[PDB]
């Protein structure tokens, strides 16, 4: 494998990625942008608060049709949701990253998410049935996720 944005200094950073994750890309991309630059103790608490509808995920780019919540004031935004599946798949990856930092001997209490990107995995194919004997696509939008954690 090869990550984008190789860290400024190895042996002080840990990596953790995932391929073909059955999570919505548009929901996961906006969730990864909320934890960009966050401390992992703050990011793990934030992602758990998203699954409990305590802190919202501000939908900056893919905000067409999404509602407007009161928790979006904290992000200087209007549209925000609480993607539960996106936050759970990032918690499993952020936990695997902490496992990669404890094996390398890194200080887990000072890790900062310096880089995290969400790509598009190949779309899985399902079909739906429409009117007048027509069949339209019912594809899924998976996502490749990768992240690098550094000490600050």
């Amino acid at each position: 494998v090869r990550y984008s944005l190789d860290p400024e200094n190895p042996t002080k950073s840990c990596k953790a990625r995932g391929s073909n994750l059955r999570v919505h890309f548009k929901n996961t991309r906006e969730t990864a942008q909320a934890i960009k630059g966050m401390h992992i103790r703050k990011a793990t608490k934030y992602l758990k608060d998203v699954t409990l509808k305590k802190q919202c995920v501000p939908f900056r780019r893919y905000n067409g049709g999404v509602g407007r919540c009161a928790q979006a004031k904290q992000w200087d935004w209007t549209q925000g949701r609480w993607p539960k599946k996106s936050a759970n798949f990032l918690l499993h990856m952020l936990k695997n990253a902490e496992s990669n930092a404890e094996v390398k001997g890194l200080d887990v209490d000072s890790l900062v998410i310096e880089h995290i990107q969400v790509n598009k995995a190949p779309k899985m194919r399902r079909r739906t049935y429409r009117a007048h004997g027509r069949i339209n696509p019912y594809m899924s939008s998976p996502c490749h996720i990768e992240m690098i954690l550094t000490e600050k």
């Binding site: 007048h132 004997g133 027509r134 069949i135």
Partner: protein, 31 residues
């Protein structure tokens, strides 16, 4: 056996055609 996904759905996928062949009077007065 490490190809479970495609070997299980090979019997369930059906080929489809590229293009699906599917199946006002308009005359005003005062001529």
């Amino acid at each position: 056996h490490d190809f479970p996904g495609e070997a299980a759905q090979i019997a369930h996928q059906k080929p489809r055609p590229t293009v699906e062949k599917i199946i006002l009077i308009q005359q005003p007065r005062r001529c």
